[model samples]
Target chain A: MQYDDDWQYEDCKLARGGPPATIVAIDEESRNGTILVDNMLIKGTAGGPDPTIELSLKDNVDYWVLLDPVKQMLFLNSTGRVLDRDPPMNIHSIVVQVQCVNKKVGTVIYHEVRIVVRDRNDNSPTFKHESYYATVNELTPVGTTIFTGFSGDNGATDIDDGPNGQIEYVIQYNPEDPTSNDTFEIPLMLTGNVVLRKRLNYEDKTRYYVIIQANDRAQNLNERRTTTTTLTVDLEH
Target chain B: MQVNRLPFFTNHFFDTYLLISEDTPVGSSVTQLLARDMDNDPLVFGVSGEEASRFFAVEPDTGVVWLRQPLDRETKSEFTVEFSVSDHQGVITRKVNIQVGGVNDNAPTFHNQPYSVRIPENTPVGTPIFIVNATDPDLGAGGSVLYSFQPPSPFFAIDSARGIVTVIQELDYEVTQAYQLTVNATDQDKTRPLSTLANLAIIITD
Candidate 1:
C-alpha cells in the first residue's frame, strides 16, 4: 500500500474576529461636542479589501449622540440641553443602536452601545423653606428635640445621587452676625433634629436665630457642598 | 529552559503606617514604598483605593508617596492608602493607614460678644450668673475650650468645664456698682493652646 493512502489532507479553518464593543462613561456636565470614543471600527479584517462602513444612531431623542463617519468616532452633541443626572431629566444610562453597514459584504449590523452619565457634586443641599420657625419653652429640658417646620420631616434634599445626595446637618453660629448663641446642636447628624445643648433663659434673650447648615456627604472631603437655613426659635411662656 | 512563575512581593514589603499633622504641606513626601519581586523582573508600582488621588499620590518608578492636598483633622482624622505592585504578571496589594494629627489652628471664639448682663445685688453667693460659650473647631484636645478669668476673680468664679460664671462673694452696690471683668477662653492642647479674651460687663441692681 502507498504511504499517501495512510494520510488525508484537509484545509485549516480560518479564524475571524470583530471589532471591540464599547461601554463609555461621561460626566453629566461634559461639554458639547466632547469626543466619547474615536477610531471605532465596525468592519473587521474579514470584511475584505477597502470595505465601506457607515455609522448612524437609531433614536436620537435629545440628539446627544453625534457620529463621525469619516473618523469613525462618537461625540456628545445635543441640540436642546446638555446631559443632566437630576430628576425628570435624569439620564442615567442610554443605549444607542449603532447601525453599521458593510457595503462590500452587503451586510448590516446593529451594535448596542452603552453610554453612562455619571453623577457630580454640582448641587448643594437645599431646605424646603429658607427659614424655619419653631416655638420652644425656655424651661424645656436639655436634649429635648425641638419641633420646627423642617424637623420630623425631610429637611433637606440634594439632587445628586450616591454620596453626593446624602445629607448631613450641623448647627453653626452665624459668622456674618455672630450674636446668636450656640445653644442648639443637631443630635442626629442625618436628620434635622435639633436638641438644646445649653440652658435657655428668656430673661436674657427672648428669641434666637439658630443657623443650621445642610451639607452633602460627598465622597471627596474637599467637594462637600453646604447650604444654610435659619431656624427662628421663639421662647414660649 | 526557564519556567514562567508568578511574581510576588518580598517579605520585607509589608503594610505601612504614617502619622502626619493636618498642616502638612502639599507636595511633601509622606513615605516611600518598597517592594521586591521574587522573579527579579522590573517592578511597577501604583496607588488606588479611597484616599488615592484624593489627598495623596504615589510615584510609579520611585514608589514615593506624597501629599496632594491639604489635610483637615476635624473633617477627616484618618485615611487609607491602597497600593499595588506587579512585575507585569500577578499583583501584590498593600495598604497604608495614615493618622492625621491635630494642631491649634483655630482659636476659641465667643458667639455673642459684648457680654453685658443685669443682676440683683442681693443675689446669694454660689448662684449661677450666666453661661458663656466659646467654640473651637479643631479635633480632640485642640477643640476642647475651657473658660476662666484671665487674672483670678475676687468675687466671681467660672466653671471651666461648664463655662458658667457664678458669684463667689457678696456684690455691694455702694462699694462697686459695676464690674468690668475679662473672661479668657483657652484650648486644651498642651503643645499649642489657643486663647481668646472677652470683656464682660455686669450692672448691680437693687
Candidate 2:
C-alpha cells in the first residue's frame, strides 16, 4: 500500500449492509462539562435470533465508557466538570470495534469508532511574577520591547493544553476612565510583551500600574485569571 | 451417545484486574469476561450485586464484559464486582477488580525566562551563557524533564537534569554569523508525556 502512489482505496464490503456503528467523526472530540450525553446509535441486524451489541478495548488505556443497552447509547464521561493540566491533557480519544455476529450462521461484521475526550475550561491563568517590575527610561522608543516577555510564553510553556493551554492576554480596566486605554499596550501576539503605546513624560506619570489578565478560551468567567504589575519609569537624562 | 455431564470449569472468562485511568471516557471498553464449560452447553453470563453490576456488562454469546460507566481513581479508588455464569448443570460466580491509575495532572512550567537574549557567541567568552529553567507541576516520572535541541546544534550542549544550556563548540562568526537554537524540554509521562519549546539565539558579534 505504501508504494502505490496516487492510489485511492475504499472498502465496499460494509456497503452491502451489516452492523455499522457511528459517531460525528472517526476522530471526535467531546468537550468536558458543558458537553453532555450524545447518543450514538449502534445499528445492526442483531445476529440471527440472538444478536448483540459488542464492544471491547485493550487491557490498559485511559478512557472511561458508559453504556445503556436499553437505549442503545454510549456516554463518554468526565468528572468534576473541570478541565486543567491535571486531567489527561491528551490521548483522551480511543477507537473501539463493535462486531455484529449471527450466532447460528457464525457470521461477523465489525465497525470501528474513535472518540476523543477533551478538557473543559478548568484553569484560571496566573502569572509567574505576581507583579512584573520593569524600569524603562522616560523617553524610551515607542516600539521598544518594554517587557512583553511572560518569562513564559502565553501558554506554550503553559504546563497545559486544551482550554487551559489556549490563553489570551488582555488589559483589565475601568470603562469609566477615558485614559484607561492609554499608557501601556500589551500585544495579543506577545505572550507577555508589554510596550509603551504612548510617550511617557517624567512630569506626567512617574509610576504606572497595569493589571494584566491571562484568560482561557473556555468562555467561563470562573476560568479567567489576572495579575497586576508595577512599571516604574525612571527619569534619566 | 455422548453422556451429558455437569459443566465444570475452574476459571472465569473475565480478566481478574481491570486497568483504567481518569482519562478513560465513559462507554469505553474495560475488557471481556467469560467462564468456560467442559460439557458442550450454552452459558449465560450474569453480573450480580446492585452497586457493582451497574458498571459491569456481559455478552452472552461471546462472554465479553465491558465497562458500563466512566471511572476515576480519584473519585473511587477501586471497583470490586461479582458476576456469574450459568448453564444446565450449575452456576459459577467470581469477583473481578477494576484498578484505575493516576492522571497527568499538570503541564510542565518554564521559569518564564527571556525567550530572546544576546550572547557573545562561540567566537569567545567560552562560558555557559544562560540556563533553561522549566519544571512540571506533575510529580514522580510525569514531572521529570529531559532537555534537547531541535534541528540539533552541534555547537551547543544542554544539561538534561539542570536545564543549563552551554556552548560546547568553538563557534566562528564567519562560519555562521548568528545561531537560533530550538530548545525542547520533554517530561517523563510514559503514556502521554508533556513537552515545551523555546528559542535560544546566540548572536555572534565581531
Model 1 chain B: lowest-lDDT 10 consecutive positions: B8-17
Tell me each candidate's TM-score.
0.47, 0.37
Top candidate on TM-score is 1
lDDT of 2 by residue, A29-148 (tens): 444433222543433333245444333332213444454434434555455442222435444344454433323322233444444333444345655654555678887988676765
RMSD of each: 40.8, 34.6
Candidate 1 accuracy as lDDT: 0.69
Off by over 4 Å in 2: A1-21, A25-63, A69-71, A77-88, A118-122, A151-167, A172-181, A187-192, A197-205, A216-237, B1-206
Tens-place lDDT digits, model 2, residues B1-206:
34343332233222224456656666665566545555768877767898567776777666676667766543664566776778855675666555555555555667766655566644443467778877764433455565677866778777655667777788776778777888888765546768888787777776
* lDDT on C-alpha atoms for all candidate structures: 0.69, 0.53
Model 2 residue A128 CA deviation in Å: 2.5
Q: Write the per-residue lDDT of candidate 1 for residues A1-237, one digit (tens) a residue.
A: 533521111001001122122456678878888887665554433233553454567766667888876666788886467788788788865657566653442233444455766678889988887688789899999878875455544588888865578787778877653655367777656666787777889888778788888899675789999998888888987
Looking at model 1 chain A, report the run of 10 residues with the lowest lDDT sum.
A6-15
Kept native contacts, as fractions per model, are 0.00, 0.00
Clashes of 2: 29
